[PDB]
Ligand binder design. Structure first.
Ligand code: AMP
Ligand code: AMP
Ligand code: TRP
Ligand code: TRP
Lengths: 321, 325
């Protein structure tokens, strides 16, 4: 079973979920999946300390609510596993300054500059085979491959060289007000996105404002060139209900845009309400969250420590007694 | 309540009699007055490539040498940096409270050469700040080459405390031995010309040979007189002898009246090499007792970790991490 590593920022849209996470939830027996809530990456940007703590627990409960199973997979909070920072320092010594400077000055903090090395350590600790990345993480993954190959050439094969996982994604979900732009969790305009915790009244409101077209009479037809918004609304509904585009075009024959939007909103919220019930149950049980964090960190450290031991032996450290 | 003192010991090279007589010899006798911490910094060492087994051996060499000098593991905390994970943990965290420009203005860093150095060489001042701040250190006894590093640690501590309240203590800073063949240049652990240097582990014979070649002057006739400007060589040998024996410069001047530079060199070799023979005796017994060094490292890492973990827990609480359950 291939080992898969994903870092989860403690800060998700229906795009993240239906395009990737929903299917990964069903892949936990074919793969050894690892989910790392990267609170040590989050602190490269200031925020109120209690907000970060709350958001770490939020993120853990959301992943559990989505269906990540702590027995089948390894899920944990990065700072609870000291090996991440330990390996991260060691790998600084096998990273060129020029590699970090060429991926994005006197007033930024050194964590902003150095966090690609920590990311490399996150991955390499677990003998990871596969990393699912957004396109904006491509050069970070490539650095981790180069560090692994460079270290291996010096000391022998210590690290697995990880590969990108190409999704075979469940859906492509576009921004509600920019149907040519992919829906992104980092979008500063939140009316483009539907977050997984949004209530049905918020969902209907964002769906009702989604851009359509000026066709008269209005017609529900898939056409990415001339009807991008209506096409995106059909793709969202298809991602939720599994119906093909032709079935949906038939279902909405003789219907206006208001009706398509209402049914998309109702279908999205039907999906999210089940997710939110599970979320509230996990999030409101902090005793259970602590057990998951405790179990996951010790499972993670058990494997991470085997890799660090090999790394420390290879670079020349006296083994800890 | 005793002030906390933190020193980082590089597991590489050879300590000189300048290192010893100028600093380490006195700290050996201050172990009851201060809470002294000695950290053998193997995580800093790997910013420079070397054969891995050499670094492992050098780590043990350095431990055995600090013990031979008289660091008492029952009075002071002595340990190997990599055995205490909190060093790397706080080191990462403090990256996020360090300005890029602070590291880029480090004198040794301050284009093409820049791209080729490893990121550890760029980032180790932050790890150094972590090393110090983990132990609520009050005093860091450090040489001139580390003044900029100590100031960065003070800046980081102050800017972290200003954000989060009082978490870190703000540290403060705390003989005359010149190069044997260049007596205007201080004797340096890092000198490429070994003949300038007397290492703590060189045996009498090599020490004696190096001392007899030490530069003096061409005064006619030769006179053992103290004068740093005009007789730097003779003056260095007098200062070395004075640092070893505790005799004043006036006492030695009288002692050498009518004597020649060869007599002065002979006394310096005897006095120095006497200091070294006692030191080496302790070194070889400690160094060959692997059981003993293991127990010292285990104990010291345990004591170090107990303090560092308290600090890191407070740092992690202040920053906003969920506490490890
Ligand atoms: N709007 C979206 N529609 C479909 N899939 C998405 C969307 N956003 C992210 N993904 C998936 O999630 C991963 C990237 O997520 P992120 O890390 O948020 O960029 C990739 O595997 C994508 O297939
Ligand atoms: N040749 C020397 N004479 C006197 N003190 C020295 C000498 N070399 C090093 N030291 C002391 O050793 C400490 C640190 O040495 P270093 O960092 O190697 O220059 C400082 O307290 C110095 O004063
Ligand atoms: N850089 C990633 C988070 C991350 C940290 N370590 C990782 C390792 C693998 C994948 C992702 C990560 C992000 O911003 O989203
Ligand atoms: N930078 C120091 C070693 C060191 C690491 N951490 C320290 C903390 C305090 C004093 C010294 C250190 C040197 O090369 O000599």
């Amino acid at each position: 079973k291939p080992i898969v590593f994903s870092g989860a920022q403690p800060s998700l849209t229906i795009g993240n979920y239906m395009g990737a996470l929903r299917q990964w939830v069903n892949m936990q027996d074919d793969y050894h999946c690892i989910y790392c809530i990267v609170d040590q990456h989050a602190i490269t940007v200031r925020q109120d300390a209690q907000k970060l703590r709350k958001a770490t627990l939020d993120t853990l409960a959301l992943y559990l609510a989505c269906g990540i199973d702590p027995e089948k997979s390894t899920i944990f909070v990065q700072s609870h596993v000291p090996e991440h920072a330990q390996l991260g320092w060691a790998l600084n010594c096998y990273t060129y300054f020029g590699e970090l400077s060429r991926m994005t000055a006197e007033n930024i903090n050194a964590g902003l500059f150095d966090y690609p090395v920590l990311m490399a350590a996150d991955i390499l600790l677990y003998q990871t085979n596969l990393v699912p990345v957004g396109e904006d993480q491509k050069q970070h993954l490539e650095l981790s491959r180069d560090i692994a190959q460079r270290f291996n050439a010096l000391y022998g094969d210590i690290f697995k060289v990880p590969e990108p996982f190409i999704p075979k994604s469940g859906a492509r979900v576009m921004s509600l007000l920019e149907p040519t732009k992919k829906m992104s969790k980092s979008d500063d305009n939140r009316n483009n996105v539907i977050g997984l915790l949004e209530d049905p009244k918020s969902v209907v409101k964002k769906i009702k404002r989604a851009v359509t077209d000026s066709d008269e009479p209005p017609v529900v037809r898939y056409d990415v060139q001339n009807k991008a918004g209506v096409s995106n609304l059909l793709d969202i509904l298809s991602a939720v209900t599994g119906q093909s585009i032709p079935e949906l075009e038939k279902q909405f024959e003789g219907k206006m845009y208001g009706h398509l939007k209402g049914e998309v909103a109702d279908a999205v919220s039907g999906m999210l309400t089940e997710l939110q019930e599970r979320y509230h149950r996990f999030r409101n049980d902090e005793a259970f969250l602590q057990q998951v964090m405790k179990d996951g960190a010790e499972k993670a450290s058990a494997h991470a420590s085997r890799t660090l031991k090999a790394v420390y032996e290879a670079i020349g450290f006296v083994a800890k007694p």
